[PDB]
mmCIF file of C-alpha atoms and ligand atoms in Angstrom:
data_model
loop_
_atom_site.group_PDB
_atom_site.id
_atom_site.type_symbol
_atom_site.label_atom_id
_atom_site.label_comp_id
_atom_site.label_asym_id
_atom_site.label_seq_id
_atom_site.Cartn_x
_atom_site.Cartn_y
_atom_site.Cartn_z
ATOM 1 C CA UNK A 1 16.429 4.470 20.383
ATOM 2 C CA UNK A 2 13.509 6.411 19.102
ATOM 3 C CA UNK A 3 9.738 4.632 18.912
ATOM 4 C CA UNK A 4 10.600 1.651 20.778
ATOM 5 C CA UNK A 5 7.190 0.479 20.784
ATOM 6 C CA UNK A 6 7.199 0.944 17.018
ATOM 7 C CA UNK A 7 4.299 3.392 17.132
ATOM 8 C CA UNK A 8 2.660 4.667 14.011
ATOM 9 C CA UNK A 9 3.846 8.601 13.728
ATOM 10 C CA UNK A 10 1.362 11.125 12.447
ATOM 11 C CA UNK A 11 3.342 14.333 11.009
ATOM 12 C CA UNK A 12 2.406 17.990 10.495
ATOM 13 C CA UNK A 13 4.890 19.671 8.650
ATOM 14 C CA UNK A 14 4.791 22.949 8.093
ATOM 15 C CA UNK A 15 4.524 24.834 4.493
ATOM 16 C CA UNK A 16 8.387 25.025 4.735
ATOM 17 C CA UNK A 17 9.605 21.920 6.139
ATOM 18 C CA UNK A 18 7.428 20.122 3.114
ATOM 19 C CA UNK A 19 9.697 21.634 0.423
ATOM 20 C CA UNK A 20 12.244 18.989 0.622
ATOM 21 C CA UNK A 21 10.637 15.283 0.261
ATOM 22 C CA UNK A 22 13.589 13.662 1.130
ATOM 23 C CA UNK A 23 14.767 16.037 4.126
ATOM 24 C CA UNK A 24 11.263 15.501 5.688
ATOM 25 C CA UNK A 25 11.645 11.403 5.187
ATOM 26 C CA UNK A 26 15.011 11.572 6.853
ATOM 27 C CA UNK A 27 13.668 13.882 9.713
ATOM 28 C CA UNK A 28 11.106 11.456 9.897
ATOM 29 C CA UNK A 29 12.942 8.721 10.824
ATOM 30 C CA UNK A 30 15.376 10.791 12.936
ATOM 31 C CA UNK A 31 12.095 10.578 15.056
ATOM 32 C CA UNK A 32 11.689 6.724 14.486
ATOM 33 C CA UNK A 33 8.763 6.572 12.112
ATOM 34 C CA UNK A 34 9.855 3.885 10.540
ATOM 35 C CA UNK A 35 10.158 1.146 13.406
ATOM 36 C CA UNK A 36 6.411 1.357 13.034
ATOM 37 C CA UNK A 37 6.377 0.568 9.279
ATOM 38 C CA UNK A 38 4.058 3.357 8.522
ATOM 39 C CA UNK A 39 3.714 6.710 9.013
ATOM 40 C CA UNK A 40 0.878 9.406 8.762
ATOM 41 C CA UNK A 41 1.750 12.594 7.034
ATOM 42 C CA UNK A 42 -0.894 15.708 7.239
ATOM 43 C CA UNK A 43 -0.097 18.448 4.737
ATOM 44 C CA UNK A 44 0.145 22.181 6.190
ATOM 45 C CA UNK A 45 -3.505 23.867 5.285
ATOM 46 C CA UNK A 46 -1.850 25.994 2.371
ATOM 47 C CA UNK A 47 -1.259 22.890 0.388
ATOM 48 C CA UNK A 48 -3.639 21.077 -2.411
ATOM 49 C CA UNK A 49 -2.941 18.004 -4.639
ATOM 50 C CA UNK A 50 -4.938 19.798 -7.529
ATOM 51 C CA UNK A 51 -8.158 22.669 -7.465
ATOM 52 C CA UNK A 52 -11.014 20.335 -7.649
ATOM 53 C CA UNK A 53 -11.810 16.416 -8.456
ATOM 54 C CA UNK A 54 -14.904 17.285 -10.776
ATOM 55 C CA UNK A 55 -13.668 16.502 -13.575
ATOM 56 C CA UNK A 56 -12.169 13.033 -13.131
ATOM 57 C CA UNK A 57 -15.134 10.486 -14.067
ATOM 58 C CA UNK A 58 -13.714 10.117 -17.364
ATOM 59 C CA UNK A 59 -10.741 7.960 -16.369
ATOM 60 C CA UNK A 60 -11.198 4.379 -17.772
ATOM 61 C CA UNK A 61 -10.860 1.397 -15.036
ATOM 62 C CA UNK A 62 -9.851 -0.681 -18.096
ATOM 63 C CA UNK A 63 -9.930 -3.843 -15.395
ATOM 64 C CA UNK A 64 -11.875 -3.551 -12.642
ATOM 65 C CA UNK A 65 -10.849 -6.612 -10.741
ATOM 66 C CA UNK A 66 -14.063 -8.405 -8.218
ATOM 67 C CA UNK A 67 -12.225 -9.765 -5.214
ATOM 68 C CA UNK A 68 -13.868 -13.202 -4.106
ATOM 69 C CA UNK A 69 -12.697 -14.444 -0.806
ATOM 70 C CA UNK A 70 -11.880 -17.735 0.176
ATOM 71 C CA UNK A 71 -11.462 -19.407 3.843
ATOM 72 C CA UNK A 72 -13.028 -18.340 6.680
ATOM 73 C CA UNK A 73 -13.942 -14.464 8.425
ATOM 74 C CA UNK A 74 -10.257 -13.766 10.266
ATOM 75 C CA UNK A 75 -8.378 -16.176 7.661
ATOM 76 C CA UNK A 76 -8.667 -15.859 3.897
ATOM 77 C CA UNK A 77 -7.120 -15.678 0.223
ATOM 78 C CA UNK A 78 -9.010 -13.315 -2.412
ATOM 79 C CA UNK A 79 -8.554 -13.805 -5.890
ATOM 80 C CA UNK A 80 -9.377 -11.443 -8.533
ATOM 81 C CA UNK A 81 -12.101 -11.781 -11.211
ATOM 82 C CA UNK A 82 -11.098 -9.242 -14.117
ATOM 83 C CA UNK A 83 -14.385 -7.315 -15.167
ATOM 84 C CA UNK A 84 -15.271 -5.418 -18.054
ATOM 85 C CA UNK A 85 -14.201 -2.099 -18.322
ATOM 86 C CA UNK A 86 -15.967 0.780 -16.961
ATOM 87 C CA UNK A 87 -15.375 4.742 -16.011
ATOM 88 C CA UNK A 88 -14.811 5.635 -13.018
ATOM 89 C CA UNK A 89 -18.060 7.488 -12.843
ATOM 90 C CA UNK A 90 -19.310 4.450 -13.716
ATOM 91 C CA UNK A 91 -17.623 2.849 -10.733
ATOM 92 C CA UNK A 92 -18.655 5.759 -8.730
ATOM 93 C CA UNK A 93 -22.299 5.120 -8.919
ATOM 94 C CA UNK A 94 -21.805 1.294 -8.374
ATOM 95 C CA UNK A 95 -20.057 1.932 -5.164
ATOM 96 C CA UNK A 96 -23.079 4.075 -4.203
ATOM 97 C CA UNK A 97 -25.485 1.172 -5.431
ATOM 98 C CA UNK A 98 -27.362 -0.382 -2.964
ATOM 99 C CA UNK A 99 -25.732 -4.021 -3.544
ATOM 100 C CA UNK A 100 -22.010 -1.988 -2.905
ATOM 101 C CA UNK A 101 -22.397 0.682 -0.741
ATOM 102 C CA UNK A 102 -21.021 1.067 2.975
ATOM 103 C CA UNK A 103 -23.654 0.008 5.270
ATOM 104 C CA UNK A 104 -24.408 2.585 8.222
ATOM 105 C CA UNK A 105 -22.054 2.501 10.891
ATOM 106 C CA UNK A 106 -21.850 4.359 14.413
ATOM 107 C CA UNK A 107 -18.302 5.343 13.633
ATOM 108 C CA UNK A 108 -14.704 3.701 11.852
ATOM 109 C CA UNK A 109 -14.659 1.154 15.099
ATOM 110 C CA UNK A 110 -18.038 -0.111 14.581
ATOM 111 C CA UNK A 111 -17.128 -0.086 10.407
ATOM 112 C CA UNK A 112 -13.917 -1.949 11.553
ATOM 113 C CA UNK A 113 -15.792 -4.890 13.303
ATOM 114 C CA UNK A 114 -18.516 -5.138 10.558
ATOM 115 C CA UNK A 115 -15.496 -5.384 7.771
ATOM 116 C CA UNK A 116 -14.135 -8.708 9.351
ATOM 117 C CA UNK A 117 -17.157 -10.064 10.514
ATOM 118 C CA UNK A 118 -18.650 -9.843 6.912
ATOM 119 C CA UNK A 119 -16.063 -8.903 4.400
ATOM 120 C CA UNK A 120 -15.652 -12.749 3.184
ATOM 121 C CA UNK A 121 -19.453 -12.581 2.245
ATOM 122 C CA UNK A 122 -19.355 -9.965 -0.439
ATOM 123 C CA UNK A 123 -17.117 -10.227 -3.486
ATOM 124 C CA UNK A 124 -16.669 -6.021 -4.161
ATOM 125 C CA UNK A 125 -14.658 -4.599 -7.134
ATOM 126 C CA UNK A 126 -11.445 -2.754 -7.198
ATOM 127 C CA UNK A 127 -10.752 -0.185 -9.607
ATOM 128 C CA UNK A 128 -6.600 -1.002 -8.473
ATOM 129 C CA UNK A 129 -3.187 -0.682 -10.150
ATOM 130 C CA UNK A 130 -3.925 2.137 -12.909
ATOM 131 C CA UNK A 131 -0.858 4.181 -14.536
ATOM 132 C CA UNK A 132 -1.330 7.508 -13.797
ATOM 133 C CA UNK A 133 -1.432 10.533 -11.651
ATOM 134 C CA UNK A 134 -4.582 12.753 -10.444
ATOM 135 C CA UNK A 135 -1.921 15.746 -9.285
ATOM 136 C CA UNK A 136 -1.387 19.291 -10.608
ATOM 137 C CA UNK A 137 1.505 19.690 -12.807
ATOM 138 C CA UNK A 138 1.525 23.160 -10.808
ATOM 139 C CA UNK A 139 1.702 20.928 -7.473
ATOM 140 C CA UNK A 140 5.808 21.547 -6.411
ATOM 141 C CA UNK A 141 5.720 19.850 -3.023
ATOM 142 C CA UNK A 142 4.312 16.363 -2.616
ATOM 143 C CA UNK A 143 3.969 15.494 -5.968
ATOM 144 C CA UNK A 144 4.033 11.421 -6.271
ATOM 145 C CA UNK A 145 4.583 12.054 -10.063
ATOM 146 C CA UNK A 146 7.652 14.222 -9.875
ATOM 147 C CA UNK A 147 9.598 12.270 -6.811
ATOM 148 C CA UNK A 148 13.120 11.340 -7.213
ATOM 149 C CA UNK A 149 12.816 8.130 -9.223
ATOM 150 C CA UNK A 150 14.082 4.637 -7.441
ATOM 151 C CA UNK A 151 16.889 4.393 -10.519
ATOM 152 C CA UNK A 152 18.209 7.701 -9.975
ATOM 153 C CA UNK A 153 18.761 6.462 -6.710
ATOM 154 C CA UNK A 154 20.580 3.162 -6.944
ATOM 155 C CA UNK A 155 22.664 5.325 -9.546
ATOM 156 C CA UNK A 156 23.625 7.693 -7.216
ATOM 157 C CA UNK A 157 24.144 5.617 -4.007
ATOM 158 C CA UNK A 158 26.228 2.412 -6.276
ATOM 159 C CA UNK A 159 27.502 4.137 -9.521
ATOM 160 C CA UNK A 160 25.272 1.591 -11.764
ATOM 161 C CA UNK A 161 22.900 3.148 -14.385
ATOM 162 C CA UNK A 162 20.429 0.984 -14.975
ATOM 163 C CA UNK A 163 17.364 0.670 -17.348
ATOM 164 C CA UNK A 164 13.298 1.526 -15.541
ATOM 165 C CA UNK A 165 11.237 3.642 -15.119
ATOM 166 C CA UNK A 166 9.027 4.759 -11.695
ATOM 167 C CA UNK A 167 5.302 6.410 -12.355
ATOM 168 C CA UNK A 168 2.435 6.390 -9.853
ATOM 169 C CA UNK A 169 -0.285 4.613 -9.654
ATOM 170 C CA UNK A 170 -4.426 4.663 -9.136
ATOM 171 C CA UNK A 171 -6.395 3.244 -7.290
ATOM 172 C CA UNK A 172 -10.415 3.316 -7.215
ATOM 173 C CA UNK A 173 -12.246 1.759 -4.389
ATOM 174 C CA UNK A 174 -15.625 0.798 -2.566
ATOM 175 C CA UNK A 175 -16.669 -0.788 0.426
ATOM 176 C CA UNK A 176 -14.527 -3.849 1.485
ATOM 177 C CA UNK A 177 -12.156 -3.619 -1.360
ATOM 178 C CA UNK A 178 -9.350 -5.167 0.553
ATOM 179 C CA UNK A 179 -5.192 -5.238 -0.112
ATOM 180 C CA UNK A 180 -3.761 -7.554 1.306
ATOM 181 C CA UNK A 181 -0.688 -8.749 3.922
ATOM 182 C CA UNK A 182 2.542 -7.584 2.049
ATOM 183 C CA UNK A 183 5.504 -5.932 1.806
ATOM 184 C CA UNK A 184 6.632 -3.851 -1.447
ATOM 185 C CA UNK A 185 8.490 -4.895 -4.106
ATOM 186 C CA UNK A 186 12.052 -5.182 -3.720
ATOM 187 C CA UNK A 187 11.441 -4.147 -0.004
ATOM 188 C CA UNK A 188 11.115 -0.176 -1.226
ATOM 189 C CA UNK A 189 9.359 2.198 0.406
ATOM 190 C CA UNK A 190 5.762 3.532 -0.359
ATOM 191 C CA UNK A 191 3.721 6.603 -0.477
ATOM 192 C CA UNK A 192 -0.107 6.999 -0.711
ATOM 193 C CA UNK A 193 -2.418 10.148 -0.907
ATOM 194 C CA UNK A 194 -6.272 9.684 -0.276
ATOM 195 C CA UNK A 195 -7.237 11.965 -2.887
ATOM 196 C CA UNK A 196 -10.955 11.888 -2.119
ATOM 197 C CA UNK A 197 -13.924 10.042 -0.471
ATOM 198 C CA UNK A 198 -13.996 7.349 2.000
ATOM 199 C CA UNK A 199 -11.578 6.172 4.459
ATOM 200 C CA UNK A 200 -8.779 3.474 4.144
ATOM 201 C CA UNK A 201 -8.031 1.677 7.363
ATOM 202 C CA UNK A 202 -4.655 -0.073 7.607
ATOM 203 C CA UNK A 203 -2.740 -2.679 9.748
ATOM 204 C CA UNK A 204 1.044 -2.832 10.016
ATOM 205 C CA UNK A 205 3.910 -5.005 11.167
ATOM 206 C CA UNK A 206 7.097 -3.099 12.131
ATOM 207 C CA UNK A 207 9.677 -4.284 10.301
ATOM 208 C CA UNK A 208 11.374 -5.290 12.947
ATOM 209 C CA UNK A 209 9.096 -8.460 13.315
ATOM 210 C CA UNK A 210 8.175 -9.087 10.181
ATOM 211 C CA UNK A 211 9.337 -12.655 9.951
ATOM 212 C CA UNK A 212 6.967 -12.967 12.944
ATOM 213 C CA UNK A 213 3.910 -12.396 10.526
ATOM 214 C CA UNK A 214 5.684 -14.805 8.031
ATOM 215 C CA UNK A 215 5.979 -17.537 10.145
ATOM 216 C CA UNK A 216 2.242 -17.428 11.155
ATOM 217 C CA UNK A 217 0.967 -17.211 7.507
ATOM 218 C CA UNK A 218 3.157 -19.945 6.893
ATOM 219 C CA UNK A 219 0.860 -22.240 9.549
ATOM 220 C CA UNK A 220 -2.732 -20.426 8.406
ATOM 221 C CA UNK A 221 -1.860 -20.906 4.964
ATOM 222 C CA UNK A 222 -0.058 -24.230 4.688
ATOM 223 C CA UNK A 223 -0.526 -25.496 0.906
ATOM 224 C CA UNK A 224 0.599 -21.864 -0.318
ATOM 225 C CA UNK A 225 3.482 -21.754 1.792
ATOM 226 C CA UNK A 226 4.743 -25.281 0.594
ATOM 227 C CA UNK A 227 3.974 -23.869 -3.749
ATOM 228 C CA UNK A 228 6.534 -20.858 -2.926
ATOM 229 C CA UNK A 229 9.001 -19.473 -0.076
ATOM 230 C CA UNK A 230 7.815 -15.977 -0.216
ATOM 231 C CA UNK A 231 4.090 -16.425 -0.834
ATOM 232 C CA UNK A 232 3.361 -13.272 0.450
ATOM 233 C CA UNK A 233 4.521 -11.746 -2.598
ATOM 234 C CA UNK A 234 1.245 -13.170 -4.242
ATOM 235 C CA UNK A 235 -0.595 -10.548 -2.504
ATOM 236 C CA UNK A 236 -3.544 -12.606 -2.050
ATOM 237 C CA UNK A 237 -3.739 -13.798 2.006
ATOM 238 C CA UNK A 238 -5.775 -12.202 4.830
ATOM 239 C CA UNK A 239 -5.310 -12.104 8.820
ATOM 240 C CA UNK A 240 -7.641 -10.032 10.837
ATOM 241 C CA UNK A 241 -6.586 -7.759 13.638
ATOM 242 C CA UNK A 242 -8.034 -10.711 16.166
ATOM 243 C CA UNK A 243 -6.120 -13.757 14.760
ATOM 244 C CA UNK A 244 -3.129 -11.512 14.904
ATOM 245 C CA UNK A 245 -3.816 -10.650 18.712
ATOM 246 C CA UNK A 246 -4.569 -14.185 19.508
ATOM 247 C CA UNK A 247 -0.865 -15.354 17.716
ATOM 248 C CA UNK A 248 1.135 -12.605 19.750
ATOM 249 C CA UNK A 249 1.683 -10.822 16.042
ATOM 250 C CA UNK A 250 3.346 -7.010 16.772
ATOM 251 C CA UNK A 251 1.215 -4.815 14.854
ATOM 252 C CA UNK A 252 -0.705 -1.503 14.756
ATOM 253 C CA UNK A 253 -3.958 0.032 12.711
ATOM 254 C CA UNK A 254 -4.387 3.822 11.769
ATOM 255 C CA UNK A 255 -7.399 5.123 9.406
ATOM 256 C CA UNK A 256 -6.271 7.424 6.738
ATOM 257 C CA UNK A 257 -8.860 10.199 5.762
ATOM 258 C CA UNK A 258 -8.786 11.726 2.343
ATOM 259 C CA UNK A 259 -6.322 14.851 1.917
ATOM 260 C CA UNK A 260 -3.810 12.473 3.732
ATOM 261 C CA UNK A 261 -0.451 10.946 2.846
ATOM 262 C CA UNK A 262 0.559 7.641 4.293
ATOM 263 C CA UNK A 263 4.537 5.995 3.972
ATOM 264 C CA UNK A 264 4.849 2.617 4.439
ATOM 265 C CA UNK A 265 8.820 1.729 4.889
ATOM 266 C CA UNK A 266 10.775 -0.806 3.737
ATOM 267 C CA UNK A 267 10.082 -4.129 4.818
ATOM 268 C CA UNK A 268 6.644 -2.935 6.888
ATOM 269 C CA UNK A 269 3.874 -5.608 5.866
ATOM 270 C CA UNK A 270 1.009 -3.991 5.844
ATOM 271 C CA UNK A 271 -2.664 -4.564 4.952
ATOM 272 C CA UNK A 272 -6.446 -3.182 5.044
ATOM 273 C CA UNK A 273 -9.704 -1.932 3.433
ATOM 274 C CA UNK A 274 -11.718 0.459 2.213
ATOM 275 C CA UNK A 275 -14.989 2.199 3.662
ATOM 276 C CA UNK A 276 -16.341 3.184 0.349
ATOM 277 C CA UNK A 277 -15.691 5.194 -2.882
ATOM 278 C CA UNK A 278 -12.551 6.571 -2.894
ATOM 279 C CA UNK A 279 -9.611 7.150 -4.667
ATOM 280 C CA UNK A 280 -5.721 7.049 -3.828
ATOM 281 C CA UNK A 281 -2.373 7.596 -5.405
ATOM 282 C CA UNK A 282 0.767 5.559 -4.765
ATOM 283 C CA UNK A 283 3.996 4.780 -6.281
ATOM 284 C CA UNK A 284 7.553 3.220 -4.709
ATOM 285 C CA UNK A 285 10.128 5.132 -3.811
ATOM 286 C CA UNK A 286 14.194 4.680 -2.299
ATOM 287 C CA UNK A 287 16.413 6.021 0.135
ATOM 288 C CA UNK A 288 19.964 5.667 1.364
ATOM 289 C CA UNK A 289 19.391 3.330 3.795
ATOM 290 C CA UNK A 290 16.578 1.297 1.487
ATOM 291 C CA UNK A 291 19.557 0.183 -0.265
ATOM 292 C CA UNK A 292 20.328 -2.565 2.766
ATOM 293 C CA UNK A 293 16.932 -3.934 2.717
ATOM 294 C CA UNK A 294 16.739 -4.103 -1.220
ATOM 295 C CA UNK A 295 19.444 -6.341 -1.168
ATOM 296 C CA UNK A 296 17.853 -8.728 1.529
ATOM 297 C CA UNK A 297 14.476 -8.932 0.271
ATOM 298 C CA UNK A 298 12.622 -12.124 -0.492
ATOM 299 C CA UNK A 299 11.865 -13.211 -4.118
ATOM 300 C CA UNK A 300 8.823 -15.062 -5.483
ATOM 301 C CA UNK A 301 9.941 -17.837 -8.233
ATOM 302 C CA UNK A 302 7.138 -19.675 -8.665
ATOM 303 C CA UNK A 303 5.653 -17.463 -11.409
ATOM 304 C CA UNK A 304 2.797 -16.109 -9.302
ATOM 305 C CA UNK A 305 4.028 -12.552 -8.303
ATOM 306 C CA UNK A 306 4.515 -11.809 -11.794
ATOM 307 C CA UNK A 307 5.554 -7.703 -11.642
ATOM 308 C CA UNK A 308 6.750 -4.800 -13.316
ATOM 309 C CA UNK A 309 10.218 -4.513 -15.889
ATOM 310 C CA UNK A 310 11.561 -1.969 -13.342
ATOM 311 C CA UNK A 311 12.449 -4.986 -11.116
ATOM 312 C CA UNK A 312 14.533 -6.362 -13.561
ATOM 313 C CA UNK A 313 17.418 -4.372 -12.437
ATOM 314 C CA UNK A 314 16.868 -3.925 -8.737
ATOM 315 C CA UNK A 315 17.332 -7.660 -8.722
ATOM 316 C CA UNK A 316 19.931 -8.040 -11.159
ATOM 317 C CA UNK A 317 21.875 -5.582 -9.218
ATOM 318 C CA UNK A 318 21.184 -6.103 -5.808
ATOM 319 C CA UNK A 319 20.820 -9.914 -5.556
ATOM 320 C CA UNK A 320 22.815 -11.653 -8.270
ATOM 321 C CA UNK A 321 22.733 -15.044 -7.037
ATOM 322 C CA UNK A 322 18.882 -15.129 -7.133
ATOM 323 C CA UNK A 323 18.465 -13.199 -10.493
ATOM 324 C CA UNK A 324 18.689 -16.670 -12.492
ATOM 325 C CA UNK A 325 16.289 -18.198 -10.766
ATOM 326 C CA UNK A 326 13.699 -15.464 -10.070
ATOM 327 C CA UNK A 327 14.118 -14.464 -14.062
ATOM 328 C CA UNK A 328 12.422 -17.823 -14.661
ATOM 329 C CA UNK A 329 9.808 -17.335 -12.336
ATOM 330 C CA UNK A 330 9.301 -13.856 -14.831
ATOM 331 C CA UNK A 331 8.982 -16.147 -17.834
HETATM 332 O O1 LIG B 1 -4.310 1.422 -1.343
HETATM 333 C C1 LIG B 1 -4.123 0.200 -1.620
HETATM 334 O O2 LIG B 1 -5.012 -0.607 -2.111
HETATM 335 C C2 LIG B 1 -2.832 -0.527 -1.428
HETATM 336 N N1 LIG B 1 -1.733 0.445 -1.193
HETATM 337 C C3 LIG B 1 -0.550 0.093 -0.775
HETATM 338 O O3 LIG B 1 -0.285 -1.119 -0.444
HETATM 339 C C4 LIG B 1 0.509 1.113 -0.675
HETATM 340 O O4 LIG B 1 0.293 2.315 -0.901
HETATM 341 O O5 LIG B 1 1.660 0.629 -0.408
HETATM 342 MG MG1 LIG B 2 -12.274 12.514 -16.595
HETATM 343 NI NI1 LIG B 3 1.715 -1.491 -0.342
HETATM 344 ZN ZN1 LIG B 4 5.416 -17.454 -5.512
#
C-alpha cells in the first residue's frame, strides 16, 4: 500500500506530465496522495495562471463576511457577520491596516502559534465564496475554469444526464480569516490555487479516519451535534492542532505559498487560516473512484448547510433514500 502513514505529497510535474489534469490526479494517487487527504501540487517554471494581478482591484466583494469566534483558543464556532460591500482594493488596504494586518513573526511556525493563541480575539473579514475565475482564457493546463465539470462526470461513469452546473470560486483573505473543519460537498474532491500574497496554512484528516475527527467534535461541540447528525456540514467549528494531538486525532499541516495548487480528496476534512492578503481560486471536482464516496456521504437536514442547486442531483442520484428528507432541509 502506498503512503501508509497518510503523508501529505508535494508534486512537481513537469511541463508535459501537466497536460492531462486527470492523468496527473490518477498518477497521483497511484503514489497514494490521497490517504493523506491533501496534496501539494508545484507547477513546472514555464507555467502562469495569467501575466500579471495588477489589474484585479476592481472585483466587487459584494459580502464581505466578519468572522466572530465563539468558545475558547483551541475550541471554537465562528459565525459570519455579512458587511457592506467593498472592492477588493478596498479590502486590500484594510488587510494592510494597522487594526488587520499580520503581526511580525520570526517565521510560519512562530505565525502558527500566534494564530491559535489569539485568533478567537480578533473578528477579521473574509472576502469568501465569489463566482468567478482570476485565470487566462489563454491558460490550457491547470485551468480551474475549464476542468471537466462534476456532471459530465456522473454522466459518463452512470449513464444519467442530469441538470448543474460547476464554476470556480474566489476567495479574498487577511490575517486570521479562518475555514473551518470540513469535508466538501457531496464528499467531491477540491482544488485551490494561491493566486497571490500571503500564505494559507492547512490541517488535514486522512480520510481514512475521518469519523475519528467526527466523533471528537461530537464531545467538544455537544449542543450542535444533538441540532443535526452531520454538523460539520455547517462549516462553522474549530479544533487546533494541540486539542487534536491531545485526543489522538490522525492529522497533518502543510503551508501553501502563492503560485501553488493544493487537492483536497474526497472525504479529507480539512481546515486552516490565512497569514494575510491573499487571494485563492477553488472549485469541486469528480473522479472515477469519487463516485463510491458520493454515494456514502453525510447530509445536513436541519436547514443550516443550506448549498448550491448543483447538489440537487448528486443527491437525487446518488442517495435516493435521503433525497426526501435532505430536500426539506433545502426548503
Ligand atoms: O481557501 C479557503 O478558505 C477554503 N478552501 C477550501 O476549503 C478548499 O479549497 O477546499
Ligand atoms: Mg479589477
Ligand atoms: Ni474545502
Ligand atoms: Zn445541519
Amino acid at each position: 500500500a502506498q503512503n501508509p502513514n497518510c503523508n501529505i505529497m508535494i508534486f512537481h510535474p513537469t511541463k508535459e506530465e501537466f497536460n492531462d489534469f486527470d492523468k496527473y490526479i490518477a498518477y497521483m494517487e497511484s503514489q497514494g496522495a490521497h490517504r493523506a487527504g491533501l496534496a501539494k501540487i508545484i507547477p513546472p517554471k514555464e507555467w502562469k495562471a495569467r501575466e500579471t494581478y495588477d489589474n484585479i482591484s476592481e472585483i466587487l466583494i459584494a459580502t464581505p463576511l466578519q468572522q466572530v469566534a465563539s468558545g475558547r483558543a483551541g475550541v471554537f464556532t465562528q459565525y459570519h457577520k455579512k458587511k457592506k460591500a467593498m472592492t477588493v482594493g478596498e479590502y486590500r488596504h484594510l488587510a494592510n491596516s494597522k487594526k488587520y494586518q499580520t503581526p511580525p513573526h520570526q517565521n510560519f511556525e512562530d505565525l502558527e502559534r500566534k494564530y491559535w493563541k489569539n485568533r478567537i480575539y480578533n473578528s477579521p473579514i473574509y472576502g469568501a465564496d465569489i463566482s468567478g475565475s482570476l485565470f487566462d482564457e489563454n491558460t490550457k493546463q491547470w485551468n480551474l475554469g475549464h476542468l471537466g465539470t462534476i456532471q459530465d462526470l456522473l454522466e459518463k461513469e452512470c449513464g444519467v444526464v442530469i441538470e448543474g452546473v460547476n464554476t470556480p470560486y474566489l476567495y479574498f483573505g487577511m490575517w486570521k480569516t479562518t475555514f473551518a473543519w470540513h469535508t466538501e460537498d457531496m464528499d467531491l474532491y477540491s482544488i485551490n490555487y494561491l493566486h497571490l500574497g500571503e500564505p494559507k496554512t492547512w490541517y488535514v484528516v486522512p480520510p481514512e479516519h475521518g469519523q475519528r475527527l467526527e466523533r471528537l467534535a461530537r464531545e467538544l461541540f455537544p449542543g450542535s451535534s444533538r441540532g443535526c447528525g452531520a454538523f460539520l456540514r455547517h462549516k462553522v467549528a474549530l479544533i487546533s492542532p494541540t486539542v487534536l494531538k491531545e485526543n489522538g486525532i490522525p492529522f497533518n499541516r502543510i503551508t501553501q505559498e502563492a503560485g501553488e495548487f493544493m487537492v483536497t480528496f474526497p472525504y479529507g476534512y480539512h481546515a486552516g487560516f490565512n497569514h494575510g492578503f491573499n487571494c485563492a481560486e477553488a472549485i469541486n471536482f469528480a473522479t472515477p473512484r469519487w463516485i463510491d464516496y458520493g454515494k456514502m456521504a453525510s447530509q445536513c437536514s436541519c436547514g443550516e448547510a443550506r448549498v448550491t442547486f448543483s447538489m440537487d442531483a448528486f443527491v437525487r442520484i446518488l442517495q435516493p433514500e435521503r433525497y426526501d428528507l435532505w430536500k426539506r432541509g433545502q426548503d
